[PDB]
Amino acid sequence: MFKNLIWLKEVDSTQERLKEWNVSYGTALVADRQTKEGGLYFSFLLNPKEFENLLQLPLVLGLSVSEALEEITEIPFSLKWPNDVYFQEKKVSGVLCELSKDKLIVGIGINVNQREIPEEIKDRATTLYEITGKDWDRKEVLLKVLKRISENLKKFKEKSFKEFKGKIESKMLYLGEEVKLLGEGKITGKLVGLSEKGGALILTEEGIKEILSGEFSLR
Amino acid sequence: MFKNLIWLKEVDSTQERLKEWNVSYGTALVADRQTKQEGGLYFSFLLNPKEFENLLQLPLVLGLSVSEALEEITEIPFSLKWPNDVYFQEKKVSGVLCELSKDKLIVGIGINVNQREIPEEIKDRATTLYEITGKDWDRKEVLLKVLKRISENLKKFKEKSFKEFKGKIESKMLYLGEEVKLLGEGKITGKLVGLSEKGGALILTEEGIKEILSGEFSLRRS
């Protein structure tokens, strides 16, 4: 579980600082805002040897965020393969797992109370305030999310991805829908689910194709 | 000189944070409060130990810098109590500390901005900008202005010398021309007549002038 919080009013980047400072496992570096109001950003370390599959990890983390956000707001969220949390077609939280030398640094951002969503992103991004019309205590949101991550990572470590695969698939945006791999005009088809290793499975004209990276969008 | 800001809500001490977490020059580590209540402004930053080897002149230049910034913000004049504090009349408003940790020179500054509760235990020696001006100031504005003054003064201090500040620092010195006592590693008593070129306090004692060059002494009115 997370036993210590280092809360910053402002900082350049939580991911970056965890690359630079030696924080202990169980510590979440939180920031009210990152300098390259209402958002929630935090990072923490994981044992790189406990999670060697960084396709499955972001999905389990995304799942954890979606579960915590629904418990707090009562609103159901989707997961966009391979690492973001969405409400319908708009992103509410982003998950990033970075391998840096000796560390596995997890970074998560959640749009909680921001009031002004630019016009350029209004169609692809949202916030809990926008979705619910209410402000939420960011620390309570953080604690709930951290507790969910703790529980799922523990079960993930003790069992396997098979404990989350089905749940993740049921929340995947575009599941069953026709999609294309952004930038790769060749790969197009129905997104049917995930491979055992966490890869996205597309049923193309010439059978199933397992995708291990990239970004999907509806056709 | 300062662009990157790391602002924590609470820390043990900004000094300690900079001892543990590596930071680059130009970065200020700020905290709303230090554990060892609200309204104060505390921050630390690193300086190159090679360009500021006189840790008596340095605190006086930093104190002057803080003094100038607060005066430009509040339009109120502040005095400097040799060798590292900023005062308004007989009460402290800001303190400066310079520490040599390993191969680093960690500078720590504290400013009483909007604190509301001043214990009777120290109301005679401590005050806040709020109590003085009766208003409440944007601490980030205060910070930015102070970091700017410090940046400008250190550039010049490093380019030229203490002679550029000596006179200005002496004219703001608390107790100048009054009977004082220095305590800490011994006791020196007499009239504070000025400041030396080395940044030492000039005391007229029964044995004539004594130039205090140690920063381990506390200067207080007699």
Automatic annotation (TrEMBL), chain B:
Keywords: ATP-binding, Biotin, Ligase, Nucleotide-binding. The keyword Ligase applies. It catalyses: biotin + L-lysyl-[protein] + ATP = N(6)-biotinyl-L-lysyl-[protein] + AMP + diphosphate + H(+). Coiled coil: none annotated. Its EC number is 6.3.4.15. CDD domains: BPL (cd16442). One of its GO terms (molecular function) is ATP binding. Residues 1-158 form the BPL/LPL catalytic domain. It is an enzyme of class 6 (ligase). InterPro entries: aa-tRNA-synth_II/BPL/LPL, Biotin_CoA_COase_ligase, BPL_C, BPL_LPL_catalytic. ATP binds at K92, N112, S218. Biotin binds at S13, T14, Q34, K92. GO terms for cellular component: cytoplasm. PANTHER family: BIOTIN PROTEIN LIGASE, BIOTIN--PROTEIN LIGASE. This is biotin--[biotin carboxyl-carrier protein] ligase.
